RNA sequence: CCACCCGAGAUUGAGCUAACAGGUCUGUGAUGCCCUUAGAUGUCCGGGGCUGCACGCGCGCUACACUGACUGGCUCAGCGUGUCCUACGCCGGCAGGCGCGGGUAACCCGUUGAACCCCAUUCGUGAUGGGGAUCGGGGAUUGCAAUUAUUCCCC
């Protein structure tokens, strides 16, 4: 199957705790603000970050975690 | 025992059989006991044996246990007065302090109440007298041996009493509910579990089926409704600060009572909601999920109007602080509204949403971006409730008119909410067109929502696929003439040369959506228009054309099926002619279309399938995983289709195989194609294809195990794994050595790369046979891998 | 009309069956004064002697006694008798009377109502 | 986790017997020495000993008693057991035999019928009837065999 990596976990936690305000629900808007925010090496890591943060903003906006 | 079971002096023989129960030999006593039980259950002799019961119990310290075992085995087959007298005898013997005789007596009561005796054996008055006579014991709270079976026997007795006369049973139930709540204070978890299970079973079987006969209960009820309210106040006073340990069980009991009784118990049920809301205000509450489930069950039973009259939302417009204490109510309402009215949703949640959105925008334009985000998230949360309200509305025939223009404007100019609105529409349809006036209203507004949804899907950039699924179902529920009109307009837009490629693709997607919902003439005209498009050099146009052909052939009944049986010859000719010029993505829908014409293919069609075979195998090794899945499903489908063209299934399967056998001879990628096809076929047609024939194919695979290409070796390893899984160990044992010899002399690099497949194969072989045989017949290095498998078999245990 | 309680002490358990009777306290078929440890016979009579003869006129208590020794035995019997009186006056008689007798019993000796929680340690 | 729409791609290809201190144990040397009617405890047969006893260091049991000992009566448990654990009757001072049943076990032993303790009799401050060793005779089991007392019972 497929599993999320721990570096993606910690980077997305940093993004959530830092700039949740400009983040939203759309995938591409989250991806572009994510590539705007941080120091970023790779495309695939960015896309994994964007997908994970989009899914967890689908999660946490229903209720706190 | 046999003689008396098969058949004045007979009473003497029965007395002689009965009188030696008290014989001290454990083997004689058990034989006599089983004989008496077989004679009675295989009756005019019940009075005599019950009199013997009472007499020689009253004469009697070890025979009482045996005699109570017979009473356990024989209480249902007794007359009513003798049941009463034996019950008095059991009370007289549990007046003593002995644990064993009390346990045997209560087990006898368990067997008596469990068998559900008729009116001749146990009456309602006698059941009530026995039940009320059992209330004197309850030694303490925490003995844990007699208490569980104690409330079990009057659980069964209360079930029987409700079954005999329901009003008296419901009348006497709530004081037992109060005693159950009282004995939920026990320090043992088994007492709590037994009480919870007993009260849950009583509520589900004795109270729930009589939900309509009781009717609505208020604070001034008279009959069994008062009893309903009074075990409600028992289980609600079981929520106080005395417990702190049974709160999960009490919440489960509250949840099942809400599901059982809420719709008519709503006037008295409010203070329980207030107390439940007050419990969630605790600093550290570990039963948050259970309380949320209980409140969700209450909302599901009643509906949010009375819940919000009881526990109101404090997010009504302008608030002072920023910590909403009842913000869990909106997820509860979203997750658990299923059978409410849509008019409440309109008249309560529309102006409040408008005011919160206006306040959020006014605060966002004023600089404060923290409160505005909270208000926007709140209004999004409270208007995700619409799919919940669209689950099963009871007034959607009159309240859907009040939301049509609102939902049209919201799906037009409010993008962030659009998906939910689409979902709501889909949700409504998927479970709301059961009646006919409802579906008529949905069609009457469908004629208005269709241009809006078409313009939404056709705009440039957006959630296109949710709108497309909504359009698909929403057009399956509408009238055919407007479908024909919009299909004609979409065909005009497609055939217009002054349209861009994105617009052309969007209108082709609309054609895909409109295709299965039209009539036979419109479908035939659309098929005539789309038929020249199958040879287009653009992969997108061919993909949409093949999707149209798949969608018109997808419906098992309707105008599409009549179109298929009308134009099967032309469809076969066109699909065989367009085989050469099909693009790589277009393979994925086309196979499905071929799938959609294999399941209803007549006997005189072998040439079509035997011409489609190499395309299907080359699609089993296509790039797209969806094309591979469709090709495997199509292989299974034509394998099933050849099982209908002849009388012998095995011979037809052999013909189907010799139609695909030469594919192991040609190109290397075609060889891997055919090995993968045989691997997929071996898992579906395991024994019917014939074990010896399997062996032959297996031998050929060993020759293909000698190939240089990695793909052929991988496919051969997969086939060997499937064969080891499928074909029998007795037939394996003749052919273990040859296949494992072919594995052994593979290569160094091939063994190193494919180490996990060989490891799994050796694991399966060692599991299915002896370790020493595979150890001996393999070469040296493989031995090491072999021995590792052993600790799996050692340490998976 | 009747209650069944128990009194525990170490291992000894004495089950008291209390009924509206005629003023007889029966312990395993024997009265209170004819139990063998006559040196320790006052403890068995402390509820009866302390609380008076008056409202025991219509109480029949049958005590079935099993286990333990002799001292723990008679203590279990006396605590079962006291708990039987408390339970009977809780169930069929008013609340204030049983509260009063509980207050008097706790004022005299705590073990007359609650059992000794310590037992033989392994 | 499954399936599906869109999408070219929802997973198509390359690289990764070796290492262990993670456990632990008797296979490969034409291995160095020392021995082999000086058997690295050679097999069996018969009888003894491990208890033997002047003495020291110590674990324990019984006591020195009157809050006791004897006699009779009284009434209360649990951990465990068994095909050798025993229920019943007879012959028995008495250990024990004889005829019979159960139990491969919350069942039959076994409500495990305990003992100090209690209630009555006698003894009455002395090497006493306390305390019991060490010896002398008989009897009965256990065992191929009780002599260097196996064990128990009666003076």
UniProtKB/Swiss-Prot annotation, chain A:
Originating gene: RPS17
Record: disease: Diamond-Blackfan anemia 4: A form of Diamond-Blackfan anemia, a congenital non-regenerative hypoplastic anemia that usually presents early in infancy. Diamond-Blackfan anemia is characterized by a moderate to severe macrocytic anemia, erythroblastopenia, and an increased risk of developing leukemia. 30 to 40% of Diamond-Blackfan anemia patients present with short stature and congenital anomalies, the most frequent being craniofacial (Pierre-Robin syndrome and cleft palate), thumb and urogenital anomalies.
Subunit structure: Component of the small ribosomal subunit. Part of the small subunit (SSU) processome, composed of more than 70 proteins and the RNA chaperone small nucleolar RNA (snoRNA) U3.
Localisation: Cytoplasm; Nucleus, Nucleolus
Protein name: Small ribosomal subunit protein eS17
Protein's job: Component of the small ribosomal subunit. The ribosome is a large ribonucleoprotein complex responsible for the synthesis of proteins in the cell. Part of the small subunit (SSU) processome, first precursor of the small eukaryotic ribosomal subunit. During the assembly of the SSU processome in the nucleolus, many ribosome biogenesis factors, an RNA chaperone and ribosomal proteins associate with the nascent pre-rRNA and work in concert to generate RNA folding, modifications, rearrangements and cleavage as well as targeted degradation of pre-ribosomal RNA by the RNA exosome.
Family label: Belongs to the eukaryotic ribosomal protein eS17 family.
Residues carrying N6-succinyllysine: 18
Swiss-Prot record, chain B:
Membrane topology: Single-pass membrane protein
Keywords (A to Z) from UniProt: Isopeptide bond, Membrane, Nucleus, Phosphoprotein, Transmembrane, Transmembrane helix, Ubl conjugation
Record's keyword annotation contains NAD: no
A single Gene Ontology CC term: nucleolus
UniProt subcellular location: Nucleus, Nucleolus; Nucleus membrane
Family of this protein: Belongs to the RRP12 family.
Protein name: RRP12-like protein
Organism: Homo sapiens (Human)
High-level lineage: Eukaryota, Metazoa, Chordata, Craniata, Vertebrata
Curated annotation (Swiss-Prot), chain C:
Post-translational modification N6-acetyllysine, affected residues: 53
Tagged with keyword Metal-binding: no
Transmembrane spans: none
Record's keyword terms, sorted: Acetylation, Cytoplasm, Nucleus, Phosphoprotein, Ribonucleoprotein, Ribosomal protein
A GO CC term assigned to this protein in UniProt: extracellular exosome
GO terms for biological process, alphabetical: cellular response to leukemia inhibitory factor; cytoplasmic translation; maturation of SSU-rRNA from tricistronic rRNA transcript (SSU-rRNA, 5.8S rRNA, LSU-rRNA); ribosomal small subunit biogenesis; rRNA processing; translation
Subcellular location as annotated: Cytoplasm; Nucleus, Nucleolus
UniProt key word Phosphoprotein: yes
GO molecular function, one term: RNA binding
Subunit structure: Component of the small ribosomal subunit. Part of the small subunit (SSU) processome, composed of more than 70 proteins and the RNA chaperone small nucleolar RNA (snoRNA) U3.
Similarity section: Belongs to the universal ribosomal protein uS9 family.
Role, per record: Component of the small ribosomal subunit. The ribosome is a large ribonucleoprotein complex responsible for the synthesis of proteins in the cell. Part of the small subunit (SSU) processome, first precursor of the small eukaryotic ribosomal subunit. During the assembly of the SSU processome in the nucleolus, many ribosome biogenesis factors, an RNA chaperone and ribosomal proteins associate with the nascent pre-rRNA and work in concert to generate RNA folding, modifications, rearrangements and cleavage as well as targeted degradation of pre-ribosomal RNA by the RNA exosome.
Entry protein name: Small ribosomal subunit protein uS9
